[PDB]
Design an enzyme around this catalytic site. Structure first.
Site, PDB file in Angstrom:
ATOM      1  N   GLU A  16       0.810  -1.218   0.000  1.00  0.00           N
ATOM      2  CA  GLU A  16       0.000   0.000   0.000  1.00  0.00           C
ATOM      3  C   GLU A  16       0.838   1.259   0.000  1.00  0.00           C
ATOM      4  O   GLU A  16       2.062   1.203   0.091  1.00  0.00           O
ATOM      5  CB  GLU A  16      -0.932   0.022   1.219  1.00  0.00           C
ATOM      6  CG  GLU A  16      -2.305  -0.531   0.951  1.00  0.00           C
ATOM      7  CD  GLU A  16      -3.101   0.375   0.035  1.00  0.00           C
ATOM      8  OE1 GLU A  16      -2.593   1.452  -0.348  1.00  0.00           O
ATOM      9  OE2 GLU A  16      -4.244   0.015  -0.295  1.00  0.00           O
ATOM     10  N   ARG A  99      -7.933   1.255  12.780  1.00  0.00           N
ATOM     11  CA  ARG A  99      -6.607   1.693  12.362  1.00  0.00           C
ATOM     12  C   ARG A  99      -6.751   2.787  11.320  1.00  0.00           C
ATOM     13  O   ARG A  99      -7.795   2.925  10.685  1.00  0.00           O
ATOM     14  CB  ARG A  99      -5.754   0.530  11.826  1.00  0.00           C
ATOM     15  CG  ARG A  99      -6.320  -0.190  10.609  1.00  0.00           C
ATOM     16  CD  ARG A  99      -5.250  -1.031   9.925  1.00  0.00           C
ATOM     17  NE  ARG A  99      -5.771  -1.833   8.817  1.00  0.00           N
ATOM     18  CZ  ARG A  99      -5.816  -1.426   7.554  1.00  0.00           C
ATOM     19  NH1 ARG A  99      -5.387  -0.217   7.235  1.00  0.00           N
ATOM     20  NH2 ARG A  99      -6.301  -2.223   6.610  1.00  0.00           N
ATOM     21  N   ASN A 101      -6.069   4.012   7.612  1.00  0.00           N
ATOM     22  CA  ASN A 101      -5.887   3.380   6.320  1.00  0.00           C
ATOM     23  C   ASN A 101      -5.132   4.342   5.380  1.00  0.00           C
ATOM     24  O   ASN A 101      -4.000   4.741   5.686  1.00  0.00           O
ATOM     25  CB  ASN A 101      -7.234   2.897   5.752  1.00  0.00           C
ATOM     26  CG  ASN A 101      -7.058   1.876   4.654  1.00  0.00           C
ATOM     27  OD1 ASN A 101      -6.083   1.115   4.658  1.00  0.00           O
ATOM     28  ND2 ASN A 101      -7.994   1.850   3.693  1.00  0.00           N
ATOM     29  N   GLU A 119     -10.266  -5.412   9.927  1.00  0.00           N
ATOM     30  CA  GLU A 119     -10.903  -6.666   9.539  1.00  0.00           C
ATOM     31  C   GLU A 119     -10.723  -7.717  10.640  1.00  0.00           C
ATOM     32  O   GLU A 119      -9.663  -7.803  11.262  1.00  0.00           O
ATOM     33  CB  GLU A 119     -10.326  -7.171   8.213  1.00  0.00           C
ATOM     34  N   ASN A 152     -10.119   5.576   2.105  1.00  0.00           N
ATOM     35  CA  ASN A 152      -9.194   5.069   1.114  1.00  0.00           C
ATOM     36  C   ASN A 152      -8.640   6.181   0.240  1.00  0.00           C
ATOM     37  O   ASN A 152      -8.298   7.239   0.767  1.00  0.00           O
ATOM     38  CB  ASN A 152      -9.804   3.906   0.330  1.00  0.00           C
ATOM     39  CG  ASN A 152      -8.973   2.664   0.443  1.00  0.00           C
ATOM     40  OD1 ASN A 152      -7.745   2.750   0.476  1.00  0.00           O
ATOM     41  ND2 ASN A 152      -9.618   1.500   0.516  1.00  0.00           N
ATOM     42  N   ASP A 202     -10.074   1.545  -4.327  1.00  0.00           N
ATOM     43  CA  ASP A 202      -9.075   1.476  -3.279  1.00  0.00           C
ATOM     44  C   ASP A 202      -8.248   2.771  -3.329  1.00  0.00           C
ATOM     45  O   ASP A 202      -8.783   3.855  -3.065  1.00  0.00           O
ATOM     46  CB  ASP A 202      -8.240   0.195  -3.475  1.00  0.00           C
ATOM     47  CG  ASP A 202      -7.648  -0.335  -2.184  1.00  0.00           C
ATOM     48  OD1 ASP A 202      -7.399   0.466  -1.271  1.00  0.00           O
ATOM     49  OD2 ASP A 202      -7.416  -1.560  -2.077  1.00  0.00           O
TER      50      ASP A 202
END
Ligand SMILES: [Ca+2]
Length: 297
Positions: A16, A99, A101, A119, A152, A202
């Protein structure tokens, strides 16, 4: 024309936050659940990694030196040379399992980053637990809105008057009017709705022509969008399904780097996609991107 290369078959659990660092000709990126911030030297092809104490969801350039990153629910300054993190601010202290992202620095050096519930089983998360924040240069934190599912991809228009933003479970790219001087955003509206085959939006970056490129998680593609018309201008398919984010890099930001995820891949999927989790470079797109902004605190 377009050529795709897995330049680093890193096998990231969840690669990421790609950021090009042109002063070292390197790509920075994270592997979220592995708790790593990574740096790939495009010349030597070697990669450095530093391991943090919690999942690390994004990294950004810090102008005064080293980096900043989002670790757990904390904005941190990262001393790369000492491999140490210093907490600048914390958010979501009332949340059980949140958290940060995706995050990115705005054109004025403010570090925008949003949160999500973590998750608890592949693609199972508590709804609407996140919020979008920004860390200002003096380290205070602004909260823009809550009820976010999965904060995102995000970027800014080239005239610095529009902020683009993805909450993944909206399957939409939104725009806000954005004030460069104050960091304020307003007038939220959708500029693109993803089609079924495009799956989950995303990460995202803007190009030098003001068009947005969105990585489609499970869609094995990046799509180029015109936010004025809402038209998808182009689709570039990749050899892996779990494409997570993208940025521009290389000489004069002429190449695209795409991150992806190996987590959630069944073993049969891995045989068909052995480079899942790798770093992909796309050349020949015919458009350049722009340099990342650097955090001013
Ligand atoms: Ca992401």
């Amino acid at each position: 024309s377009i050529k795709i290369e897995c330049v680093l078959p890193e096998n990231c659990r969840c690669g990421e936050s790609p950021v090009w660092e042109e002063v070292s000709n390197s790509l920075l990126f994270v592997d979220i659940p592995a708790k790593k911030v990574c740096r790939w030297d495009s010349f030597t092809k070697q990669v450095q990694r530093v391991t943090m104490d919690a999942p690390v969801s994004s990294v950004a350039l810090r102008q005064s030196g080293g980096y900043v990153a989002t670790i757990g629910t904390k904005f941190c300054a990262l001393n790369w040379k000492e491999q140490s993190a210093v907490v600048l601010a914390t958010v979501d202290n009332d949340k059980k399992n949140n958290r940060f992202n995706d995050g990115k620095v705005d054109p004025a050096g403010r570090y925008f980053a949003g949160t999500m519930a973590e998750e608890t089983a592949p693609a199972v998360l508590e709804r609407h637990q996140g919020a979008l924040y920004s860390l200002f240069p003096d380290h205070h934190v602004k909260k823009y809105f809550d009820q976010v599912d999965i904060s995102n991809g995000l970027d800014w228009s080239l005239d610095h008057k529009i902020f683009y933003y993805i909450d993944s479970l909206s399957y939409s790219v939104d725009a806000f009017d954005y004030d460069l001087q104050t960091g304020q955003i307003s007038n939220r509206r959708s500029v693109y709705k993803l089609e079924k085959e495009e799956q989950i939006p995303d990460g995202m970056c803007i190009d030098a022509e003001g068009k947005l490129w969105v990585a489609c998680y499970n869609g094995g593609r990046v799509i180029r969008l015109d936010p004025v018309t809402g038209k998808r201008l182009q689709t570039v398919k990749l050899p892996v399904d779990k494409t997570t984010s993208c940025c521009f890099g290389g000489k004069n930001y002429s190449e695209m780097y795409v991150t992806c995820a190996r987590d959630g891949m069944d073993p049969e999927g891995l045989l068909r996609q052995p480079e899942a989790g790798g770093i992909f470079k796309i050349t020949g797109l015919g458009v350049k991107g722009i340099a990342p902004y650097s955090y001013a605190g």
